[PDB]
Coordinates of C-alpha atoms and ligand atoms in Angstrom, one line a residue:
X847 CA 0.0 0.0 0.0
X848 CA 1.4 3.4 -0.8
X849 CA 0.1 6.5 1.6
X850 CA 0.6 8.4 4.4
X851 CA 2.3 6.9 7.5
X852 CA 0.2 7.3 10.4
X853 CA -0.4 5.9 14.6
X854 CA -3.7 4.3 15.1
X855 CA -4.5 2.8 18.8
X856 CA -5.8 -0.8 19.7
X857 CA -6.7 -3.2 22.3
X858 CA -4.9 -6.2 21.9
X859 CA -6.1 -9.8 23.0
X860 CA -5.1 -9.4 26.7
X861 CA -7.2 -6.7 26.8
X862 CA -4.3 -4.0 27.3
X863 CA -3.9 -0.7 24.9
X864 CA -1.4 0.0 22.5
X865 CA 0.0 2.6 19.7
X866 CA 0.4 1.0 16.7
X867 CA 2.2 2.0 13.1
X868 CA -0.9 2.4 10.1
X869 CA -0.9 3.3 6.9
X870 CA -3.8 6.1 5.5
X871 CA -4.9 5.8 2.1
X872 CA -9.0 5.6 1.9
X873 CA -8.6 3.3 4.7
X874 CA -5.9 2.8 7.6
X875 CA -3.9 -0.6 6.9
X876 CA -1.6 -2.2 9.4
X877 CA 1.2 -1.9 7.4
X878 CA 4.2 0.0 9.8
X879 CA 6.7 2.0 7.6
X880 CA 9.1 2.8 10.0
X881 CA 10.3 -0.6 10.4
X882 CA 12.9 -1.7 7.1
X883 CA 10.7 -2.9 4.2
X884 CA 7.8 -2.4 6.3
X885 CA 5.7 -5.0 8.9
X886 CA 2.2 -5.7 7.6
X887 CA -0.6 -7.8 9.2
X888 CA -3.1 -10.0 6.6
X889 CA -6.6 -11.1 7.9
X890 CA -7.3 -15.1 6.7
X891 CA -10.7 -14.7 7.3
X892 CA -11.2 -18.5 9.4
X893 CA -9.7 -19.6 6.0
X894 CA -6.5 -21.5 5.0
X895 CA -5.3 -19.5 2.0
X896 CA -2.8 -17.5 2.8
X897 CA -1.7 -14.5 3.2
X898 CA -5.5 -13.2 3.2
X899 CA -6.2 -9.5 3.0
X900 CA -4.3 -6.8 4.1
X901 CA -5.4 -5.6 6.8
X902 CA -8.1 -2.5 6.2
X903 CA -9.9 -0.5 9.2
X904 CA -11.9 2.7 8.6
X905 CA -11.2 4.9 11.4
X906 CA -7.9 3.5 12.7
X907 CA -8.9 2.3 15.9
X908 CA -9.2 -1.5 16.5
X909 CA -10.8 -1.8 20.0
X910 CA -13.2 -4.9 18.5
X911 CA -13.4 -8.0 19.0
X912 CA -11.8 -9.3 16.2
X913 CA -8.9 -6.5 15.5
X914 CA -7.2 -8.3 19.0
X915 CA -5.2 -11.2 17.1
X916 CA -4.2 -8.4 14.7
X917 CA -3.2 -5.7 17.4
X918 CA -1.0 -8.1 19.0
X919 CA 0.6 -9.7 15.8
X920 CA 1.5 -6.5 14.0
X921 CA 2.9 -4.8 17.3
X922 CA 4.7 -7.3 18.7
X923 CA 6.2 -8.1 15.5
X924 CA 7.8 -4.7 15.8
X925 CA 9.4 -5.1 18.8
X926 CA 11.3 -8.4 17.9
X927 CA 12.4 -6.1 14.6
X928 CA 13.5 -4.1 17.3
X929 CA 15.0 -6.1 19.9
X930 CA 17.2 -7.7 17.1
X931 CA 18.2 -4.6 15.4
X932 CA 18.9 -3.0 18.6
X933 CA 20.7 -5.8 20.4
X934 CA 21.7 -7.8 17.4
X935 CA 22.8 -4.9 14.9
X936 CA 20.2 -7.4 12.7
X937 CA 18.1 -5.6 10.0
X938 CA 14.8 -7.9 9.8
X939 CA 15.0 -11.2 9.9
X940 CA 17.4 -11.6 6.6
X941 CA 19.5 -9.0 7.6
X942 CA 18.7 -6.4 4.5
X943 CA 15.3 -5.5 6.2
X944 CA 13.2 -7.8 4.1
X945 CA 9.2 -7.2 4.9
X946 CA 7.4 -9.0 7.6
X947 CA 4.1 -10.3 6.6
X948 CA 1.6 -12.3 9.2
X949 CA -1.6 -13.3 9.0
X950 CA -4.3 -13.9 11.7
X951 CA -7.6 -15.6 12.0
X952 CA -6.2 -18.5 10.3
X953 CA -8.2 -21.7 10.0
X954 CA -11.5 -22.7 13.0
X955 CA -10.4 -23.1 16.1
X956 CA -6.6 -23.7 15.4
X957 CA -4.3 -24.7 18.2
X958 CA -1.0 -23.6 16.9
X959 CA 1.5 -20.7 15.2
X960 CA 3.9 -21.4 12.2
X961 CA 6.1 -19.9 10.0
X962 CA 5.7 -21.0 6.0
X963 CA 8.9 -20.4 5.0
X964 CA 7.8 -16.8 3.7
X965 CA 5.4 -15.6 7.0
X966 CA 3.7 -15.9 10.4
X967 CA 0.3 -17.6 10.5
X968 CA -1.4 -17.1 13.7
X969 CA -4.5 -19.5 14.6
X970 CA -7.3 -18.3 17.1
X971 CA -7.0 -21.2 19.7
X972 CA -10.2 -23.2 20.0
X973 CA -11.3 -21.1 23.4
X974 CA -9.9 -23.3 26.0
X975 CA -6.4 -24.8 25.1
X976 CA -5.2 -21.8 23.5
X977 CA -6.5 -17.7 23.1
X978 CA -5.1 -16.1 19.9
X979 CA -1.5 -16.8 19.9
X980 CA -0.1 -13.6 18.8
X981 CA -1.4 -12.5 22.3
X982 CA 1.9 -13.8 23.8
X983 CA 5.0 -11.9 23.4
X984 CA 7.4 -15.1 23.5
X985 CA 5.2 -17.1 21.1
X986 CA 5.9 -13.8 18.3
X987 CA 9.6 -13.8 18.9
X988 CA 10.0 -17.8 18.5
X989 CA 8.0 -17.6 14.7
X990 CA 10.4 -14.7 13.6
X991 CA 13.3 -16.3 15.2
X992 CA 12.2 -19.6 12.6
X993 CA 12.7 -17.1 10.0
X994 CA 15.9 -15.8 11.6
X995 CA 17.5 -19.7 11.4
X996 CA 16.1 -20.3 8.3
X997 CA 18.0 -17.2 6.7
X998 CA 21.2 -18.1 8.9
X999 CA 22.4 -21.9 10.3
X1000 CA 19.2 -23.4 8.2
X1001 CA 18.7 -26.1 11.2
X1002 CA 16.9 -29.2 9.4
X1003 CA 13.7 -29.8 11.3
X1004 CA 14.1 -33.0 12.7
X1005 CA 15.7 -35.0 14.9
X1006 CA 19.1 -32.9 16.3
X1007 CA 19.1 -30.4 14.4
X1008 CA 15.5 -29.7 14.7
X1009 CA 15.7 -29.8 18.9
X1010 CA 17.9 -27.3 18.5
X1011 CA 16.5 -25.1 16.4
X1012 CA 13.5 -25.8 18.4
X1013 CA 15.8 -24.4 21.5
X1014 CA 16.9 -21.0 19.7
X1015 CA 13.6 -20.3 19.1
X1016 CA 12.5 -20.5 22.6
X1017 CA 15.8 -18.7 23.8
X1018 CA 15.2 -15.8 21.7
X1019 CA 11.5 -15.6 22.4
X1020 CA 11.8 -15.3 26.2
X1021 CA 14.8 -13.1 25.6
X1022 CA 12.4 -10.4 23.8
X1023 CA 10.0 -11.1 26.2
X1024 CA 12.7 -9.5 28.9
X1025 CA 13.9 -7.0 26.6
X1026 CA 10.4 -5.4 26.4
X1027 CA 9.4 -6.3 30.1
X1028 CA 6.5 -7.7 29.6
X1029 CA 6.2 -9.9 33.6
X1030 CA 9.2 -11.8 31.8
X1031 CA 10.3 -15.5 33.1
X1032 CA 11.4 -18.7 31.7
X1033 CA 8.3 -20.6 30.6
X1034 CA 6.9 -20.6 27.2
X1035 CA 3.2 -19.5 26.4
X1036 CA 1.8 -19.3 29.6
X1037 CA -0.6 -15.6 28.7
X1038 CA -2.1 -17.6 25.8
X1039 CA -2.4 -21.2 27.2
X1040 CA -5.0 -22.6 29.0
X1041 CA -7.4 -19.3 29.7
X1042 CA -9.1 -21.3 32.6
X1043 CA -5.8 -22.7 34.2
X1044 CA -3.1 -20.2 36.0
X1045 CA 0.1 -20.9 36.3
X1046 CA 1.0 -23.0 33.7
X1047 CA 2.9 -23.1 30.5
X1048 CA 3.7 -25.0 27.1
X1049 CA 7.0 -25.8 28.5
X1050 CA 9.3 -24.5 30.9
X1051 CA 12.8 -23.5 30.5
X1052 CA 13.7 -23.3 34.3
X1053 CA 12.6 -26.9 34.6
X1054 CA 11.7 -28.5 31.2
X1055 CA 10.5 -32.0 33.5
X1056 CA 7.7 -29.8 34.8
X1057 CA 5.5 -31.2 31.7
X1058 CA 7.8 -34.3 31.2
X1059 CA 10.2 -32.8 28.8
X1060 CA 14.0 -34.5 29.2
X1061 CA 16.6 -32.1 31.0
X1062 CA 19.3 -34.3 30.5
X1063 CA 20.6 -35.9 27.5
X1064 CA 20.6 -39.8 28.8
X1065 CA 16.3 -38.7 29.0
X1066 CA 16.5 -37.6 25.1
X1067 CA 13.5 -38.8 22.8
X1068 CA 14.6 -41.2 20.2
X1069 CA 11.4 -41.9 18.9
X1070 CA 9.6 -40.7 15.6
X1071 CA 6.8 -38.6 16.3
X1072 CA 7.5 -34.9 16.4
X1073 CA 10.0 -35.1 13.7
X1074 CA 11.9 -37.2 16.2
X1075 CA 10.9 -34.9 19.0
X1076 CA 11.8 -31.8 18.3
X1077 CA 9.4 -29.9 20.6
X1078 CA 10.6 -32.6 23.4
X1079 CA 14.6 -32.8 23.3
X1080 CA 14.4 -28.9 23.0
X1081 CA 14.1 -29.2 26.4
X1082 CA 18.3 -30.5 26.9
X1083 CA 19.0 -27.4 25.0
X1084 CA 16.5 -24.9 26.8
X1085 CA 17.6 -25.6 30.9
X1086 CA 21.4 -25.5 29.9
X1087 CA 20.4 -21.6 28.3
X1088 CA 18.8 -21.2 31.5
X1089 CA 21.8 -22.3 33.5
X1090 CA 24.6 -20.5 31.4
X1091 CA 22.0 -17.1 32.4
X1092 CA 20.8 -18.1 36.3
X1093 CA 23.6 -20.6 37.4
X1094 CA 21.9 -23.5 39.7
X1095 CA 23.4 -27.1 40.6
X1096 CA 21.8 -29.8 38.3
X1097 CA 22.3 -33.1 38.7
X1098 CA 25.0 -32.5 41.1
X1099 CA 26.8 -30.2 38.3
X1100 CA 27.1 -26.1 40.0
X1101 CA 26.8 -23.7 37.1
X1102 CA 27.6 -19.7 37.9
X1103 CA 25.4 -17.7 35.9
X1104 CA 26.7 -14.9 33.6
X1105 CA 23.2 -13.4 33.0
X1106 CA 21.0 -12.8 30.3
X1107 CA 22.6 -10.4 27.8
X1108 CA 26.0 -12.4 27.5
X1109 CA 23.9 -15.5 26.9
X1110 CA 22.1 -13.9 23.9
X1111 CA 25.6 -12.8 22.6
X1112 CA 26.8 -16.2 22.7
X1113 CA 24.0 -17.9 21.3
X1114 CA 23.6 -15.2 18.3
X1115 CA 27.4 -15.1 17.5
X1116 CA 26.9 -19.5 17.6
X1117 CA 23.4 -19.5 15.9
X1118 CA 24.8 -16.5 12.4
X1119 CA 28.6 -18.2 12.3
X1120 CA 29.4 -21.0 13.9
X1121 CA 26.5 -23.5 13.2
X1122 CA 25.3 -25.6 10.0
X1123 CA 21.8 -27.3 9.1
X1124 CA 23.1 -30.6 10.3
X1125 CA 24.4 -29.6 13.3
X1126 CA 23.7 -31.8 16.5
X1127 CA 23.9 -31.3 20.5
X1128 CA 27.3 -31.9 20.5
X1129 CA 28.1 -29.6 18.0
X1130 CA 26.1 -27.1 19.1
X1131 CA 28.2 -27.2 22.6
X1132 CA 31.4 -26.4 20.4
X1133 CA 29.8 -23.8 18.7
X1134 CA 28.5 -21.8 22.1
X1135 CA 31.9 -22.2 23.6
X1136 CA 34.2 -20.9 20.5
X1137 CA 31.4 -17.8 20.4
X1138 CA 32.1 -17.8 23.9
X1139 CA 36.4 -17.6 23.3
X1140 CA 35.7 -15.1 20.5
X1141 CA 33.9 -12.9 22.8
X1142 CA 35.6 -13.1 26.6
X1143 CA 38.6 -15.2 25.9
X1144 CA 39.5 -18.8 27.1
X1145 CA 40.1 -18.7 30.3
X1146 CA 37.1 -16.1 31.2
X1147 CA 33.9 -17.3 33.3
X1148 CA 31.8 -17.1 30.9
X1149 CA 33.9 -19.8 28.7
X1150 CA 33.5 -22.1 32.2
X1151 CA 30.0 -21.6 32.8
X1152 CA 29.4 -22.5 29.3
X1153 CA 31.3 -25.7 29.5
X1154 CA 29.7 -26.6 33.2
X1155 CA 26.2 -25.7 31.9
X1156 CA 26.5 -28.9 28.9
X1157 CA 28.2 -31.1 31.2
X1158 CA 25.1 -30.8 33.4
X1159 CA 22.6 -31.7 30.9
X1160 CA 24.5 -34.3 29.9
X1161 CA 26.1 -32.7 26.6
X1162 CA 29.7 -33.9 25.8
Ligands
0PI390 C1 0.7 -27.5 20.9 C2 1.7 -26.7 20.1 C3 1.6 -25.3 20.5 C4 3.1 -27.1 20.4 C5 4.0 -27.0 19.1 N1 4.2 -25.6 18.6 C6 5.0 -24.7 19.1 O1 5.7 -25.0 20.1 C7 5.0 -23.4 18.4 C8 3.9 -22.5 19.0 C9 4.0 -22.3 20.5 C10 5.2 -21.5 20.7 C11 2.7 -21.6 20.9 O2 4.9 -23.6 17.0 P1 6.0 -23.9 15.9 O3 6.5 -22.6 15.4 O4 7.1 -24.6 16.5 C12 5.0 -25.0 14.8 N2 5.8 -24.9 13.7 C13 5.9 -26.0 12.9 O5 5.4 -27.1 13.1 O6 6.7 -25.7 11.9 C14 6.9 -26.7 10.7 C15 6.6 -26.1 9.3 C16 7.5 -26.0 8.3 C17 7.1 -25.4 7.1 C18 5.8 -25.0 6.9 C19 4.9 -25.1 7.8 C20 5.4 -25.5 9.1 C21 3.9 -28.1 18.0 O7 3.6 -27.8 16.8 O8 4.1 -29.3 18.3
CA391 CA1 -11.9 0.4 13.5
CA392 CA1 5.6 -13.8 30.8
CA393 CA1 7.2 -16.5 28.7
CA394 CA1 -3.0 -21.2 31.6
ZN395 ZN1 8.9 -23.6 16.8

């Protein structure tokens, strides 16, 4: 859409009020200018073809109903273009500021999010597993973050390689849900998940066993379903990012954390140079620990806490 760039103001599906980035020509579209080639946010209409519409209001405000999903997609979008820019010195997720495109309202009653190798599709939830998923913070950041790999180390989805990209996905995702301070913590999904049950998750970082993920490498998956487990053995990967950041004793193994920011730089600097689409756990325990040289030298604490983090979950 060409026209004049503009700030409408929404409700998202949390119920909480935000400024977003529109576009003005006969109607206001969420399309944000301001961000590289531009965010924009598609309506799918219950349907399955994608992208759907662009996504047309009259008055630019989007207080209905309906307009939530969209809201929430479109402006937390921009803050993951942010929080990579600004933290990352990453221009979109291709790093030449290629155009973010999502679409919400996809499918009846759909329990999930994806990326389609060219966008974000966003389902509704069916009411009682899941709300709209774009209402969570963490659950935005881990679809771009697909996009992010897929551009970068190009992790095959299965097995591995698949955990782990799994992994860096959830790392990143509750990383910009710190970096915009939105209650922040270590568990996956929990403001979309289960409207009528508090205080739980999809998974939990701090203590992947929680839902009966592995947290050690001798409890890996080695089954088929999941593409081998990919959502499962993520889990490995998950607590020792958790450990490297917090510290803790696991399994009799004492970890001193190094904090949040310096685990992002490792896992960034491992994730755009050091890793490959076949990479496994072992590898990936290589790769964090050279990013970790490059960055504080060999004999620093970070480089040990590293190292001590994989040897508790069972890595090398
Ligand atoms: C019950 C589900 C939420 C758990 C799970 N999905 C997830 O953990 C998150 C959504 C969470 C963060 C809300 O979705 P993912 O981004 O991992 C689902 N993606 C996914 O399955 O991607 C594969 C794919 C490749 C090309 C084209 C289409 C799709 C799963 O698909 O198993
Ligand atoms: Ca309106
Ligand atoms: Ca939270
Ligand atoms: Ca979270
Ligand atoms: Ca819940
Ligand atoms: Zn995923």
């Amino acid at each position: 859409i060409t026209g004049t760039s503009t700030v409408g103001v929404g409700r998202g599906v949390l119920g909480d009020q935000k400024n977003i980035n529109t576009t003005y020509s006969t109607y206001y579209y969420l399309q944000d200018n301001t961000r590289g080639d531009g965010i924009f946010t598609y309506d799918a209409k219950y349907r399955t073809t994608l992208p759907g519409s662009l996504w047309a209001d009259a008055d630019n405000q989007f207080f209905a109903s309906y307009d939530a999903p969209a809201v929430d997609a479109h402006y937390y979008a921009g803050v993951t273009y942010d929080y990579y820019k600004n933290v990352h010195n990453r221009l979109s997720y291709d790093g030449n500021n290629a155009a973010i495109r999502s679409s919400v309202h996809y499918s009846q009653g759909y329990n999930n999010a994806f990326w389609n190798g060219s966008e974000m599709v966003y389902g509704d939830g069916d009411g009682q597993t899941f709300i709209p998923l774009s209402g969570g913070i963490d659950v935005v950041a881990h679809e771009l973050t697909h996009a992010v790999t897929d551009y970068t180390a190009g992790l095959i989805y299965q097995n591995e390689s698949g955990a782990i990209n799994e992994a860096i996905s959830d790392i990143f995702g509750t990383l910009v849900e710190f970096y915009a301070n939105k209650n922040p913590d270590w568990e996956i999904g929990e403001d979309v998940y289960t409207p009528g049950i508090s205080g739980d998750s999809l998974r939990s970082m701090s203590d992947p066993a929680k839902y009966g993920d592995p947290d050690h490498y001798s409890k890996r998956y080695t089954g088929t379903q999941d593409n081998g487990g990919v959502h499962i053995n993520s889990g490995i990967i998950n607590k020792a990012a958790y450990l490297i950041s917090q510290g803790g004793t696991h399994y009799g193994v004492s970890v001193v954390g190094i904090g949040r920011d310096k685990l992002g730089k490792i896992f960034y600097r491992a994730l755009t140079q050091y890793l490959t689409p076949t990479s496994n756990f072992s590898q990936l325990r290589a790769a964090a620990v050279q990013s970790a040289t490059d960055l504080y030298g060999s004999t620093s604490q970070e480089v040990a806490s590293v190292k001590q983090a994989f040897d508790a979950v069972g890595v090398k």
